[model samples]
Target: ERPTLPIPDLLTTDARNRIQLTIGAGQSTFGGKTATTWGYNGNLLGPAVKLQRGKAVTVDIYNQLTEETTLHWHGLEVPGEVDGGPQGIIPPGGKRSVTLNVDQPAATCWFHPHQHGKTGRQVAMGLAGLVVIEDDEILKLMLPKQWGIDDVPVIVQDKKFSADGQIDYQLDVMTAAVGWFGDTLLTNGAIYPQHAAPRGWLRLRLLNGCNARSLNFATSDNRPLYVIASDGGLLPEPVKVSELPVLMGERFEVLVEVNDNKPFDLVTLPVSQMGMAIAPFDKPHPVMRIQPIAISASGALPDTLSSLPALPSLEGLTVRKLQLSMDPMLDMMGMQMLMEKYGDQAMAGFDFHHANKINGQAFDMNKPMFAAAKGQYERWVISGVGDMMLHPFHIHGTQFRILSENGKPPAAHRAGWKDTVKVEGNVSEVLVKFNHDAPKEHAYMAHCHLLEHEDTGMMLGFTV
Candidate 1:
């Protein structure tokens, strides 16, 4: 028998509008073996934080870990001061507090560590959480509104374990070139977990929280997944599809009709449609088992979800071209040279900063790659060059509208606001506008969502 899926505890703000979190180390059992981990206020992942729109909330984070770390609100539309990028660092045995108003629409966002060079290792060591934003409009909708019963948070991640069942964070030249790929699949920090779903329309807030791998979400019985929301908020209407591809740092809220008392699996099909060679671990695998139980049903989903604003005219908009590039051969050679020079400390070598890049430049923390005027729209064309691997481009600070994919209109499921998009040897055009101010000190970041790539050099900073 499989272990029951563990639902993250819901964290609500107090009357003082403050919530507390502590980053510390703990231990957990995976596959019946003990493994050390780090998390926010827990042994593994953090709690599910609920933020109400128009409410001011303060997040007080304490760093109990020995090293430095930064907690980033992945898709929140807040100011750069509270955005928690690489610039906002909390030292060991230190604390940092940020107060911001939840102004965006109701969406399923997330939080994770974003320290520049250690993001991949830190995240792979189990340090992430969920942020569920709610608004009056979304509360009025007839959907699953419960916390852990009808509505569930499915944080999908893959991991590789050592001989003693410890999470392996060892990186090689190939992993640095492509990204980290784990052999073991986990949902909510459990292996082969099962969820007891009520006999109703279940809402699965799916988050692809992996460091590198992309998840192709599908059902074992081939049931249609009714997608209602994307990264930003609800769509104009539900898109019924057989499978949905969720890349790193992307979120999709889908509704599944659970009427019978049968057990079906929420599995992931191979990501072969992206034209990249699928690894053996990327093959078809079951993520979680949904055992439908006889219980009262939630109400039916409405024909229309929410009304999205019409995109403005794109005449004479500032068009910026950003090319994501990485030379694996050159990067490997550089890594070898660094290893020879630094011996056991290749990570601190000089060549580590000159691997992956965007538009021929590596990530410079002190310099702003470009600037976007606040409240003004700009057309950004994010494309992949040289390598044919899939790169999920993510922008900080605000969500944008996907204009096209490879010069054509996007699919219906991708017609809503998005903060991350997959670019695979093609162009992804988006109309973006920054609403908050970002100074040169705590600027916003735009980079590949693959943590290893972002950690290495495939990232850039921009100010608004």
Candidate 2:
């Protein structure tokens, strides 16, 4: 099948200068009959909440679901009430309008339902969208402009379709253990999307909003990728690469210039490249497609991006090691399979809840999983042991410096402000600083960075 729409139409960017909006439980017909859904604006994914740095934001959220649902400002820095914690749920037909200040860097921050196990399903159903922060700092850099043309924000995910065209997420045995798998790839809520990017430089801001899947992201042209900004903010410099492993809930800001006036396309290829067995759950198959543009657009590219803060070099600082683990801690079959298949990445590690872990324990959302003092300069090393999947780790509340990964320090583009970084197998390390004004009672979450994993007890709570 060829790619379809270039941009989403129902995506209504409700511009209030400073906006006020409503998110409720809605319904949409896609793969089947009308199914229960969640949204910020429409039946499917909401529009990008276009905002600016240091600006005030007000969101008037309404809960029309049968049960409790809360809207979490995933990357915004603000008060506890507006932080959308567990207690922030708006009851059936209730409403909780939150207003906050975004004092963070310009990146691809998002909002979604963080209601424990339900989060994985609701977000997967159609609850997630792009929350873009426009910084004068970023505009000054002139990196990639021209939305819907060159600079594009791609919210990539695979969706399971029903015979009738509505989504069906009734959990089965294999999906309950390995997580649900989708057959369709959507960008910004539209299926089989296409882009008409012009020649020269273009910025592709991407977010992996899947539940359990990790996208081994690559462009169809196999071009080198440049990383100007990562999860939290801009890297000190750009790190050019060919592929990026984006797990669930992780974000990446990269710059790519298309030289293929001959015609080029971008796509996300799944982990099916690894060739899993069909023993059960279909082995999580992967697929991709790209139809070159019939015509080219106007615009070239830029050299330097906007100004980014210098990397904070931390020396002689004490390191805090938080183990990323699972519930049973050890799965003999899992370890055996890992060793046999991915021996290069697998190692003997702690088993808490039958799953290999990073911290030797399962997730606890009811209480604070860890704590840090205000204004403290600390190195928090999140180590992922056992599993071979690329664990993208994310921190709420604050953006800290990336000190090291594995043993070596991060690349120049990864040295500056960051909230999420990829942790390969075998104890990767990251340096993080605690909040200056962030409280100990309502600390941001530090979890596996994958939505399904986090929702399925792969995360931990924290306060600072």
Candidate 3:
């Protein structure tokens, strides 16, 4: 039962830089049965918002939900105040209009609730939307410009639903420790789906919307994946590869050539890290089937996509080291027991709460972990203590470039600007910038992106 990709309805801006987004409840069916869900205006998810660079867009977000929810523009570079994080919690029945100056280049960004502990459940229960920024330079690329026809947005998420079709958020020790792993996979809002596209260049914005799932993506028949853009914007050039791993809270834009009368399956392959294979993801699972028709060959894609400006050298720059991990001692003991004593069957039912941390301390919203003067550039070295699990480190309000991982340069896909870096079994270093003068009361966050870990306090705050 392959489900069709959830192509969000588009809501372009009008003459006034104003748009209204209502966060409300709805009824939708996932995997047949109906389930109560949350969305921006419609049933399952929100509309795909399109904005132009340099335009100051204002969105009046009305929180109609019973609980508070803050809409965080995941990758946009805006002022710290409008850069909605945990602090911008919208109380139930409240309204907040955030005006954003779209200054960055065109990119595939998204918006989701950033409420501290309630984020995982709210997003998992359904509230998320796509934000597309366009610029003149980026629009010049010869790519699929059609919204839902040739160019598509694919939000990949994994979930476990009860027989009645309601999302199962039940958690135990292991799920609390390592994020929850859903047995069911959803593309957009459905499962096992297929869509028809012209037999030409199909541009797909692949977004990993799962809570904890890491997609080791590959074409089922091993076709080349032409990666054209990343989190921040277009790559300097297209990167062709056989497999691309997209972690949670990350997105990649890839152009796949489709053959007439032939259908190809997009699947996730077994990706091994540090000699340990991630279960389920370690096995091949066909995610989508793309059938092509009534079109010709995808004309040869351009070799050069966009020319990126030279970045400042890291010469004599400030170097800071940050330790990111769960409580080391507890994580070690809990993991050892789960594997040696409990084994696989009882692992999920065990206890791992209050186990995640940062620099041996839990998250304190009021405290500042560090301070950087505005216009400061520093090389940050982030590592996963004991190399236990992969933590996608995300920073608020800035984009970073991966300097190296374990002293080796990052992969080709990571060569472009990024806001989140997957810190796995090695030390990952990135060059970050503090461009805003954030006051002590208003701060930015940096933490492991595993929503559960973040909810349990594996995050920290800082100000510029």
Candidate 4:
């Protein structure tokens, strides 16, 4: 017998368009063993926040934990002040609020802790949630609209537990450089969970919430996964593929046909890069079991999901070249600089594992790496220099279009708007445009989506 998939509670804005979120510690049972966890208003993960496009909502975040944390909206296009990056820190027992206008198209976004140096541990302990933005265009589609029934939220995270069944938040120098890999995979905080779907088309809003690992999602019977949306919103048309690759912080909505009342496992196939294999993830494993049931009526997926405009000419746009570097010598220089600036305080919080850097520099709270003009488009080429590894590059405050990957057109599944993209081997070019303003004090971030990398040093900030 498998545990029923736990659907996170749906939280909608009130009449005043306000939603309260409290971050606190709680206890949860995994494999009948109690483990301490952190969450937003719950024992484990937070609720699925439902928002309507073109509407304004204020999220009042209360921190009840003993330490500090920041709530970052992973895919939201909000101002840097409300973006909840490292600068937007809320101390223990403090509260902060941010009002955001849901101006983007309907998409599956997410929220998680973003405090510098502590993001990886907090998220692994369960301080994360989903944000589903709906709009007029998405509302008219003949897709699965029912929440927790026909439509589901699949937050996939891998974790390593201690001998006593507690989550181990340990990281080594090699692990920090390559990124952390966990042994056990959990879907929606449950192991070997089962979801009973209606006898029609089922929509799975997939989010790769792991700190580092990438997920290669596939069906057991080799069925096609109809991808209807990406990180930012619905795709122009559905792209059918046998396997879908979702990297850290990336989201995709896929439709699965469930006409027969049979059981199938939504599994993850083994994936490797640069000949390096990740244990446990190197082998195929089940994410969850999907069981279908009879239903009276179900809607078919539409041919056209949305009307996305084409990218403008890239002739004269500013081209920014970012190098993801993993050089120990450069990291040593950065460490020496930090020690000179902060004296003894630098070594107090310093860890040798924090050696990965972006463009030869680590993340500095007071540093603004560059500037992007608001409402202006730019071409960014993110490349991997020095040790080659898969880096999921993520830009805050805007969703961009992928121009090319390694000088070739992006894959069919990546032919939509995205806020995060996988950069490996060569270069990944994107046409990015920012609509909001961010000052030097609270600027937007561009970083590797691997939590450890981001926390350690592979991140930079830009002002618009």
* Top of the candidates by TM-score: 1
Where does model 3 exceed 4 Å of error? Answer: 1-3, 273-282, 295-300, 328-354
Q: How close to the true structure is residue 99 of candidate 4, measured as C-alpha lDDT?
A: 95
RMSD of each: 4.7, 5.0, 3.1, 6.1
Candidate 1 per-residue lDDT, tens place, 99-194, comes to 979888999999999998889999999999999999999888879877788899999998878998889895555556657767678899998799
Per-residue CA lDDT of candidate 3, range 217-336, in tens?
788788788999899888988999989988888989998978657788888765443212334444688788888878543444678888765567889888877787666555566466
What are the models' TM-scores? Answer: 0.94, 0.81, 0.92, 0.93
Per-residue lDDT of model 4, residues 1-464, tens digit only:
37999998889999888999999999988888888998898978999999999899999999999998999999999999999999999999999999989899999999998898778889999889999998888878878877888899999998878889788885555446555556778899998799989888999999999898888999988888999999999899999999998898999999998878778999998776421234445567899999888865366799888889898899999999898877665345444553454455322115645477777788887988998989999999998745556789999999999998755898977978999877876788999999999999889999999887788788999999
Whole-model alpha-carbon lDDT for candidate 2: 0.61
Model 1 CA deviation exceeding 4 Å by range: 273-282, 328-352
Give the Cα error of residue 318 in candidate 2, in Å: 4.4
lDDT of 3 at 136: 93
lDDT (C-alpha) at residue 20 in model 2: 48
| lDDT score at residue 45, model 1, on the 0-100 scale | 89
Q: Deviation in angstroms for 71 in model 4?
A: 0.5
Q: Look at candidate 3 and give me any clashing residue pairs.
A: 1-192, 2-192, 2-193, 3-191, 3-192, 3-193, 173-350, 173-351
